[model samples]
Target: SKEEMELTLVGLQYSGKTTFVNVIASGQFNEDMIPTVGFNMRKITKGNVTIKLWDIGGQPRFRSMWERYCRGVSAIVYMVDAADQEKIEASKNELHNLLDKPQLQGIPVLVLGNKRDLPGALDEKELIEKMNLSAIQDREICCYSISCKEKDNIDITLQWLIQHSK
Candidate 1:
């Protein structure tokens, strides 16, 4: 049977979470998009895998609900606005806090440092260091730099997610 996967995405507001999902779902960049209030779910099928992606809202009010949505997912895709240095620490805290939940202990964490095309965006190495991803030890962890506006690294990102479906 074809694999069916559920992945949950989280990041601070303006971190390009919705933009990333829109690009994958519509194959085009969307400008003037507003911050997500609740959550957005998209089902995407690639090859023999079907992915149900949950794009959770990142506002502080919604952060508390992250654990509920993330439970039982195949993986947790954490996004960060690499160009916005002010929020990197906040993103890191949220990420670690989420993973600390007992229910999410073994789920893989794929960190996407988005907005790489923007000036001062953190590179993969810098993002990993700033996010302190090396501190994570309980599950598969990886990081990538991508620009949804430029559609950079989307193919490899999708491939990474697909393989985790197994």
Candidate 2:
């Protein structure tokens, strides 16, 4: 099937998940910020690949339903707010819970350390360590600095998702 890749975007509230999607799907970053209440899925095709991209809400109140969407996901792009130091731990915990799901054990995860354009954003190395990703030796996780405000690296993330899906 052309849609061999089922990618999902998961992150804490106000982590720029919607902005990243808007930039990738609409190629513009002027959209107003709205907190994702639940989850939204978008389908897009690039070259020979078809992506079923799901953006899941990050609020703790909505977590009970998170597993429902992880069923067939091949890849996950986890977005983090680089500037929000206070919420980093919560974000890390959320990610840990998501990855702990037995069904998602081997899926590839791409962490988008977003808000890089901001003055106080955390760097990639800091984020990887903060997330304690090294402990998950078998799961493939890659973290990259991005700025949805400036529309950066969204395509690169998508391309990596495509390549890894195969």
Candidate 3:
């Protein structure tokens, strides 16, 4: 049997969380995705590694449930809509807030600046600066720019997930 690890994915609604999952799971993307009701689950298997992803719903009511599932997961994959500058601050605050949880401290964090194909989208460096990822110290944190629609950087993203798996 392959080694299995769980990853929890979180982001504000419409940050392309579902789209990313769709792209990874089935190699297909859709423009008319309905907002995830509560959450969704998907699996990605590469070689001997099987990653079980909890694609949590990002709606306001569901935000409180994030910590409940995050504890003891292999890592936290936080997705962001890089093309939307207005939500960057909100995303940053929520990420830091989650990291502050005692149960989640020192846990690995993988931040995905999704929607990179859009005009004026923030690049990886800009996202790091805007998200203030440098201040984090207790855990292994990395950021990558990806376009779910274009399948950009997805291979590398999967590689990082496998490398960091516990």
Candidate 4:
């Protein structure tokens, strides 16, 4: 039988969460978009797997609520700006903290290294090393390069996510 699932989007501000949402919803991107102050909510049904997607804010104060939203989701879609070096540490700490929470244990997390269309963007291997992603336990963690602006590999990313939901 078909089951329900929820996917929460997380990352530092300007990391491309909203753009990803827009593309997933509208199949296009807006060059100018305000960061999600709260979140953009939607429900998607893919075959037998139904999902609720949330693209939430990455601002500091709002970040405190990351785990709250994550607690209910079946999967997590975390996007990061690969060339954003200055905010890498902050993003790492926030991401790692949420990874340890009881609610996320054993869930699937798809970390999208967004903005890979740029020349200096981070690849999956480099992103893993930079974020210490190997240490996150009990969860199925995978990373991929994506560009919401260009609509690149978004389908592939979503396909992988659905395949891992079991």
Indicate which candidate wins on TM-score: 1
Deviation (Å) of 166 in candidate 2? 2.6
Candidate 4 lDDT tens digits, 21-92: 778767888789674587677887777877788888898878878888888667898889987877777778
Q: List the residue pairs that clash in candidate 3.
A: none
RMSD of each: 1.1, 1.7, 1.3, 1.8
Q: Which stretches of candidate 2 lie over 4 Å from their true place?
A: 1-3
Global lDDT scores for all candidate models: 0.90, 0.82, 0.89, 0.83
lDDT of 1 by residue, 111-166 (tens): 99999899999999999899899999999999999999898899889989988997
lDDT of 2 by residue, 56-144 (tens): 88888777667778767887888899899999999998888888788877878888999888988988899989888777766888898
For model 3, residues 45-100, the per-residue Cα lDDT tens digits are: 86788889999989888999999889889999999999999999999999998888
How many clashing pairs does model 3 include? 0
Model 1, global lDDT: 0.90
Off by over 4 Å in 4: 1-3, 47-49
TM-scores for candidates 1 onward, in order? 0.96, 0.91, 0.95, 0.90
**Decoy 1 TM-score against native:** 0.96
Backbone clashes per model, in order? 0, 0, 0, 0
